[PDB]
Amino acid sequence: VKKPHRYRPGTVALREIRRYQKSTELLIRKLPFQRLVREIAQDFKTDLRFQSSAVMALQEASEAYLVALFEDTNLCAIHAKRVTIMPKDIQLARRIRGERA
């Protein structure tokens, strides 16, 4: 009759994992992250200017840190016999890392 080609759930997830581990471009849009950085900074000092390279460095460091955190989170979830990462996984990863008290 007709039927869509819907991939079994979890297949496009693997395709995306392969696609994003093979690339290097930043995964957060530049402008929203720049606005977030400026807002966080304005707490510490008013009328601050940022070098474009400064925001780019912040984005690179943040994305690398988040990717490593998600790697540890995925390991924690797999340790719990699960496949989904859940906030308790992030909390355990951060607690073991020594980041969160």
């Binding site: 979890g10 997830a13 693997l14 995306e16 994992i17 696609r19 994003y20 581990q21 995964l27 957060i28 849009r29 402008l31 929203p32 992250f33 606005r35 977030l36 950085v37 807002e39 966080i40 900074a41 510490f44 000092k45 009328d47 601050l48 200017r49 940022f50 070098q51 390279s53 400064a54 780019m56 460095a57 912040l58 690179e60 460091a61 943040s62 994305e63 690398a64 840190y65 988040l66 990717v67 490593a68 955190l69 998600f70 790697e71 989170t73 995925n74 496949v83 989904t84 990462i85 859940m86 906030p87 992030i90 909390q91 951060r94």
Partner: protein, 78 residues
């Protein structure tokens, strides 16, 4: 503004991290974690820029701030 870190963007970061399935609440937790990390790094960077008596935050300030926390970053004149 913190919501500018969209759900798909966190999905991409998780995928690059090797994550197959993501819970619904992971996005808010990740936004909080990113906010904390940026707060620390930007606080150190702004401290460096203030000590230099500058109103502009230079990439070198960010690099030094990261190096302080044991997150050395290469590619920005380290």
């Amino acid at each position: 503004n913190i919501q500018g870190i969209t759900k798909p963007a966190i999905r991409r970061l998780a995928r690059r991290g090797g994550v197959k399935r993501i819970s619904g609440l992971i996005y808010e937790e990740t936004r909080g974690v990113l906010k904390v990390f940026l707060e620390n790094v930007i606080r150190d960077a702004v401290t460096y820029t203030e000590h230099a008596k500058r109103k502009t935050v230079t990439a070198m300030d960010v690099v030094y701030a990261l190096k302080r926390q044991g997150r050395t970053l290469y590619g920005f004149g380290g």
